[PDB]
Scaffold this active site. Structure first.
Site, PDB file in Angstrom:
ATOM      1  N   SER A 120      26.073  17.427  49.079  1.00  0.00           N
ATOM      2  CA  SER A 120      25.426  16.214  49.031  1.00  0.00           C
ATOM      3  C   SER A 120      25.903  15.345  50.358  1.00  0.00           C
ATOM      4  O   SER A 120      27.160  15.397  50.609  1.00  0.00           O
ATOM      5  CB  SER A 120      26.025  15.201  47.759  1.00  0.00           C
ATOM      6  OG  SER A 120      25.502  13.922  47.646  1.00  0.00           O
ATOM      7  N   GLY A 121      24.903  14.831  50.968  1.00  0.00           N
ATOM      8  CA  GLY A 121      25.233  13.959  52.134  1.00  0.00           C
ATOM      9  C   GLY A 121      25.364  14.955  53.513  1.00  0.00           C
ATOM     10  O   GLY A 121      25.496  14.396  54.688  1.00  0.00           O
ATOM     11  N   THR A 130      17.963  16.237  53.457  1.00  0.00           N
ATOM     12  CA  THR A 130      16.687  15.310  53.667  1.00  0.00           C
ATOM     13  C   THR A 130      16.410  15.126  54.837  1.00  0.00           C
ATOM     14  O   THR A 130      15.230  15.221  55.400  1.00  0.00           O
ATOM     15  CB  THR A 130      17.096  14.242  52.699  1.00  0.00           C
ATOM     16  OG1 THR A 130      17.212  14.424  51.202  1.00  0.00           O
ATOM     17  CG2 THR A 130      16.081  13.151  52.826  1.00  0.00           C
ATOM     18  N   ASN A 159      26.777   9.786  49.386  1.00  0.00           N
ATOM     19  CA  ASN A 159      25.719   9.546  50.100  1.00  0.00           C
ATOM     20  C   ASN A 159      25.009   8.373  49.995  1.00  0.00           C
ATOM     21  O   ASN A 159      24.586   7.873  48.586  1.00  0.00           O
ATOM     22  CB  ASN A 159      24.742  10.605  50.030  1.00  0.00           C
ATOM     23  CG  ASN A 159      23.604  10.648  50.848  1.00  0.00           C
ATOM     24  OD1 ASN A 159      23.593   9.647  51.907  1.00  0.00           O
ATOM     25  ND2 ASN A 159      22.969  11.638  51.139  1.00  0.00           N
ATOM     26  N   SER A 174      21.127   9.052  48.893  1.00  0.00           N
ATOM     27  CA  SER A 174      21.314  10.349  48.056  1.00  0.00           C
ATOM     28  C   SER A 174      19.700  10.726  47.322  1.00  0.00           C
ATOM     29  O   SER A 174      19.428   9.690  46.691  1.00  0.00           O
ATOM     30  CB  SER A 174      22.362  10.277  47.010  1.00  0.00           C
ATOM     31  OG  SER A 174      22.599  11.429  46.253  1.00  0.00           O
ATOM     32  N   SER A 175      19.235  11.810  47.695  1.00  0.00           N
ATOM     33  CA  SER A 175      18.118  12.319  46.553  1.00  0.00           C
ATOM     34  C   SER A 175      18.494  12.484  45.428  1.00  0.00           C
ATOM     35  O   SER A 175      19.047  13.541  45.084  1.00  0.00           O
ATOM     36  CB  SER A 175      17.687  13.263  47.542  1.00  0.00           C
ATOM     37  OG  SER A 175      17.832  13.737  48.781  1.00  0.00           O
ATOM     38  N   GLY A 211      21.854  18.290  46.754  1.00  0.00           N
ATOM     39  CA  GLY A 211      22.880  19.143  46.792  1.00  0.00           C
ATOM     40  C   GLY A 211      24.297  19.031  46.136  1.00  0.00           C
ATOM     41  O   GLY A 211      24.535  18.363  45.361  1.00  0.00           O
ATOM     42  N   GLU A 250      27.471  18.418  44.044  1.00  0.00           N
ATOM     43  CA  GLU A 250      28.118  17.426  43.975  1.00  0.00           C
ATOM     44  C   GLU A 250      29.370  17.219  43.295  1.00  0.00           C
ATOM     45  O   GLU A 250      29.177  18.082  42.025  1.00  0.00           O
ATOM     46  CB  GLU A 250      27.223  16.180  43.814  1.00  0.00           C
ATOM     47  CG  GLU A 250      26.673  16.168  42.378  1.00  0.00           C
ATOM     48  CD  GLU A 250      25.618  14.803  42.368  1.00  0.00           C
ATOM     49  OE1 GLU A 250      25.149  14.255  43.394  1.00  0.00           O
ATOM     50  OE2 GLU A 250      25.435  14.077  41.163  1.00  0.00           O
TER      51      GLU A 250
HETATM   52 MG   LIG Z   1      18.579  14.848  50.102  1.00  0.00          MG
END
Ligand SMILES: [Mg+2]
Ligand SMILES: Oc1c(Cl)c(Cl)c(Cl)c2c1[nH]c1c(Cl)cc(Cl)cc12
Length: 691
Positions: A180-181, A185, A228, A231-232, A452, A454
């Site tokens: 993550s982060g 993306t 993030n 974050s998605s 991602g 996490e």
């Molecule tokens: Mg993402």
């Protein structure tokens, strides 16, 4: 020719700075160097020492402080000659060890070179600052060029993939990995930008429509987490589609796994979906009035966390980019007004306070919140009221009005909220998809942008599915780099002695998704459709199948409600609270009946379309979330096997979202668990090209 001129933007921002005459005396030195550990407690912290002498089987070197150490030539991390510092492709390194690889990334990163080839794949270290390497100017530089003639870039891996769709008449994919982060993306965006420009033109409208399909999705499915700020909270597969000639024919977005629970609950310091904040901040005082709006501070869904903004992003400002995005996409104004009505009502549904009544069941004293929601949705408030606290079920075949307590009425409201939002998401996507799939594709490139890996202090069902996916993606690298590679070789009898690279996250995959013997998910499934089952009977069951039996599972001694899975990226402790409800994902039918009678054109499609409102049965039951997701995943892995894969490994520099701070401990973890050095070792030692 900007590639060859030392003054250009390309040379300034994508190539190693020319070293001066001092760095020359040092490059031609005969001295030799070693990477060692100053404290053998801390394995990832390295200092540099001069090799002063050597025996048969060992080197002696100078530490920085003073002393002299001895270690075996077989346990020696030698420093590459300094001509290698900043090399563009690390398969070129004489010494392939951990500090050697990290060092090269360290050198490149210190002058803002975030891209490095590690043989066949790309590595992307996140800058956490803006760097000017994505202009049209830069796109044009990469038009057509082979990989070894241009600098490392994401644009390049994108070109090679494109050349490969045309030169093999075969479908391609870009698998961008990262916790993550780490930058997935962002690099995803860049693949689309590049693809768009390079293979685009009716006019040039489709091209602008694909690009402007990501800010919509981002407003509705991204949120600030502790890891993030953007974050998605959903996974994304994007097929960019191409005609026979090789021009852009379309794109289709498939989404996975909206963290629906975020809409009703955030951890300290986190945010709900950007959209909520964008609406409240960026709307006209007229629009606030017909929607009964206020500030974020007066909504339970937006004021529990302590945080309503993100440093250096104006929510007022993002609302315009978003609205402008729905314009270019061809969402009518009747459609948007409804979209912000759905968003507005969720917030109101959030403000309903339930209290204890005369007896054990719940009453609603203040109906301000209820009435506002009913008003913006187009539904009868008294029908909603009753459907919320007094929903009807079957008992055998009899119709029984239940009277729900405070806890159960609140959950049902939440359940209504999560379904409204989830269905709204699914509808944005099917709409976008309908404008963009306009042509029968001859070819595609598929971009995978997942949530991602996490970890949080409190890790739940969502995290399990996030991390399970990250694990399958990692094994998918493992299969292509090491297993498929070597089963060729051995089949073409061209004389290969097998290497065990020691990277195999199979036993972790199976613990989660195996069916016989049953895995975590199947034990979850069986428990979800067994009627006396609790979160307590579920974790006992998991401990019973896996404690001291699977080398990948732990029953913690410290808690009676968490279990550990040892993922490729580290052990994660999972809290079991609420798993059964999250897997059943129930919604009262009376609630569904309340919202089918909506006067609103959008809300009615969320509740009446079989596309969006239906659930696939499984014998006497609905399909669980775990089985639905395990299947959509397997369905995507099957789509990927049919492509030639290109990998991008995104790398987070630190855990504080900061620029110019490459934390060695954090970056080496990721290098190990990603198999970055194993991937380089496979390319030095082996034979990629085969006719
Ligand atoms: Mg993402
Ligand atoms: O977000 C959701 C999604 Cl994204 C999907 Cl695919 C479904 Cl089927 C549902 C959902 N939310 C639901 C509720 Cl609250 C009930 C049922 Cl029966 C299905 C769903």
């Amino acid at each position: 020719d900007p590639i060859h001129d030392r003054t250009s933007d390309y040379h300034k921002y994508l190539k190693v700075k020319q070293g001066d005459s001092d760095l020359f005396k040092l490059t031609v030195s005969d001295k030799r160097y070693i990477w060692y550990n100053p404290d053998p407690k801390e394995r990832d912290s390295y200092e540099c020492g001069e090799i002063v002498s050597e025996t048969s089987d060992s080197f002696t070197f100078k530490t920085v402080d003073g002393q002299d150490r001895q270690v075996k030539k077989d346990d020696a991390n030698q420093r590459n000659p300094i001509k290698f510092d900043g090399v563009e492709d690390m398969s070129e390194l004489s010494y392939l060890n951990e500090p050697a690889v990290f060092h090269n990334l360290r050198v490149r990163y210190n002058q803002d070179l975030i891209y490095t080839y590690s043989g066949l794949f790309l590595v992307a270290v996140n800058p956490f600052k803006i760097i000017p390497i994505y202009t049209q100017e830069m796109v044009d530089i990469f038009k057509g060029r082979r990989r070894n003639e241009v600098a490392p870039h994401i644009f390049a891996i994108s070109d090679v993939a494109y050349r490969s769709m045309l030169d093999d008449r075969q479908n391609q994919s870009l698998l961008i990995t990262g916790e993550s982060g780490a930058g997935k993306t962002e690099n995803t965006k860049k693949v689309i930008q590049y693809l768009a420009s390079v293979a685009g033109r009716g006019s040039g409208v489709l091209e602008q429509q694909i690009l402007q399909a990501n800010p919509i999705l981002e407003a509705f499915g991204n949120a600030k987490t502790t890891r993030n700020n953007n974050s998605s909270r959903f996974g994304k597969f994007i097929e960019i589609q191409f005609n026979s000639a090789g021009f852009i024919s379309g794109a289709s977005i498939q989404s996975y796994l909206l963290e629906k629970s975020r809409v009703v609950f955030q951890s300290e310091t986190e945010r709900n979906y950007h959209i909520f904040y964008q609406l409240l901040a960026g709307a006209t005082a007229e629009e606030k009035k017909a929607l009964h709006l206020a500030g974020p501070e007066s909504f339970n869904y937006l004021n529990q966390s302590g945080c309503v903004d993100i440093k250096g992003v104006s929510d007022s400002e993002e609302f315009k980019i978003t609205r402008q995005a729905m314009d270019i996409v061809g969402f009518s104004q009747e459609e948007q007004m409804s979209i912000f009505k759905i968003i507005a009502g969720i917030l109101h549904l959030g403000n309903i306070k339930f209290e204890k009544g005369a007896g054990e069941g719940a009453v609603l004293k203040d109906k301000t919140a209820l009435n506002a929601a009913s008003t913006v949705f187009g539904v009868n408030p008294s029908v909603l009221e009753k459907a919320l606290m007094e929903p009807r079920i079957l008992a055998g075949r009899d119709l029984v009005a239940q009277h729900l307590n405070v806890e159960k009425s609140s959950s049902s409201r939440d359940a209504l909220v999560k379904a409204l939002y989830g269905r709204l998401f699914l509808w944005l996507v099917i709409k976008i998809n309908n404008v963009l799939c306009q042509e029968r594709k001859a070819y595609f490139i598929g971009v995978l942008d997942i949530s991602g890996f996490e970890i949080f202090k409190v890790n739940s069902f969502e995290q399990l599915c996030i991390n399970y996916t990250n694990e399958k993606l990692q094994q998918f690298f493992n299969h292509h780099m090491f297993k498929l590679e070597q089963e060729e070789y051995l089949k073409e009898k061209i004389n290969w002695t097998f290497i065990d690279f020691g990277l195999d996250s199979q036993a972790t995959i199976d613990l989660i998704d195996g069916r016989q013997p049953p895995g975590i998910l199947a034990l979850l499934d069986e428990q979800s459709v067994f009627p006396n089952a609790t979160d307590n009977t579920l974790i006992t069951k998991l401990h019973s199948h896996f404690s001291k039996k699977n080398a990948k599972y732990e029953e913690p001694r410290f808690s009676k409600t968490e279990f550990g899975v040892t993922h490729y990226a580290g052990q994660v402790m999972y809290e079991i609270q609420d798993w059964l409800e999250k897997n059943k994902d129930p919604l009262q039918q009376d609630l569904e009946l309340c919202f089918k009678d909506s006067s609103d054109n959008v809300v009615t499609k969320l509740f009446n379309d079989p596309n969006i409102a239906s659930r696939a049965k499984k014998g006497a039951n609905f399909i669980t979330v775990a089985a639905q997701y395990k299947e959509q995943l397997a369905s995507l892995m099957a789509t990927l096997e049919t492509t030639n894969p290109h990998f991008v490994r995104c790398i987070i520099p630190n855990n504080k979202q900061l620029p110019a701070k490459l934390e060695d401990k954090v970056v080496l973890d990721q290098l190990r668990c990603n198999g970055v050095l194993e991937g380089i070792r496979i390319t030095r030692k082996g034979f990629p090209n085969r006719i």
